[PDB]
Design an enzyme around this catalytic site. Structure first.
Site, PDB file in Angstrom:
ATOM      1  CD  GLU A  35      -3.150  -0.652   0.121  1.00 47.58           C
ATOM      2  OE1 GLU A  35      -3.105   0.420  -0.347  1.00 47.58           O
ATOM      3  OE2 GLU A  35      -3.875  -1.494  -0.327  1.00 47.58           O
ATOM      4  CG  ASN A  46      -8.650   7.002  -4.703  1.00 48.92           C
ATOM      5  OD1 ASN A  46      -8.545   6.931  -3.467  1.00 48.92           O
ATOM      6  ND2 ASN A  46      -7.618   6.072  -5.183  1.00 48.92           N
ATOM      7  CG  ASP A  48     -13.638   8.266  -5.208  1.00 55.32           C
ATOM      8  OD1 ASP A  48     -12.463   8.745  -4.881  1.00 55.32           O
ATOM      9  OD2 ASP A  48     -14.113   7.601  -4.533  1.00 55.32           O
ATOM     10  CB  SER A  50     -11.874   9.631  -2.043  1.00 54.01           C
ATOM     11  OG  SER A  50     -11.407   8.411  -2.845  1.00 54.01           O
ATOM     12  CG  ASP A  52      -6.496   5.758  -1.021  1.00 51.67           C
ATOM     13  OD1 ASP A  52      -7.554   5.937  -0.674  1.00 51.67           O
ATOM     14  OD2 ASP A  52      -6.401   5.202  -2.144  1.00 51.67           O
ATOM     15  CG  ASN A  59     -11.043   6.348   0.148  1.00 45.95           C
ATOM     16  OD1 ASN A  59     -12.268   6.602   0.634  1.00 45.95           O
ATOM     17  ND2 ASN A  59     -10.382   6.727  -1.133  1.00 45.95           N
ATOM     18  CG  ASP A 101     -17.340  -1.931   7.222  1.00 43.43           C
ATOM     19  OD1 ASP A 101     -18.051  -1.416   8.105  1.00 43.43           O
ATOM     20  OD2 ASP A 101     -17.187  -1.799   6.050  1.00 43.43           O
TER      21      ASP A 101
END
Ligand SMILES: [Cl-]
Ligand SMILES: [Cl-]
Ligand SMILES: [Cl-]
Ligand SMILES: [Cl-]
Ligand SMILES: [N]
Ligand SMILES: [N]
Ligand SMILES: [N]
Ligand code: NA
Ligand SMILES: [Pt+2]
Ligand SMILES: [Pt+2]
Length: 129
Positions: A35, A46, A48, A50, A52, A59, A101
């Protein structure tokens, strides 16, 4: 800060990630390797809009607030900048929330594609733990 392999494993162990929700330490170290290359200051934007953040590339659409991701939730209740600290506490506490989650570690695309189903124990081989 850029962690060493065994240095990060020890830190993650201390903060309770070994076998958290059934995921052995090697998984977490492998995810961090791919990562962020073990760099706490890593960021990536990203499509969209957003972003990270940090060692585990958490995110901004769901987990942290960076003030520029419209209609995002801040489920870890932290500024995203907190995730860039040399102290990995915030990142670990948020990651525990994420992996509980329901999707587990598949939430980390690099884990799914580069760690899952591999000999992840190799990532802690040779370390004093
Ligand atoms: Cl090390
Ligand atoms: Cl730490
Ligand atoms: Cl912690
Ligand atoms: Cl799971
Ligand atoms: N911790
Ligand atoms: N912790
Ligand atoms: N730490
Ligand atoms: Na957010
Ligand atoms: Pt620590
Ligand atoms: Pt901790």
């Amino acid at each position: 800060k850029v962690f060493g392999r065994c240095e990060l494993a020890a830190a993650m162990k201390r903060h309770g990630l070994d076998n958290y929700r059934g995921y052995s330490l090697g998984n977490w170290v492998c995810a961090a390797k791919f990562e962020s290359n073990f760099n706490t200051q890593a960021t990536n934007r990203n499509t969209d809009g957003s972003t990270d953040y940090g060692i585990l590339q958490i995110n901004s659409r769901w987990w942290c607030n960076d003030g520029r991701t419209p209609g995002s939730r801040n489920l870890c209740n932290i500024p995203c900048s907190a995730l860039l600290s040399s102290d990995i506490t915030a990142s670990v506490n948020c990651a525990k929330k994420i992996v509980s989650d329901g999707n587990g570690m598949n939430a980390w695309v690099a884990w799914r594609n580069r760690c899952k189903g591999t000999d992840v124990q190799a990532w802690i081989r040779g370390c004093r733990l």
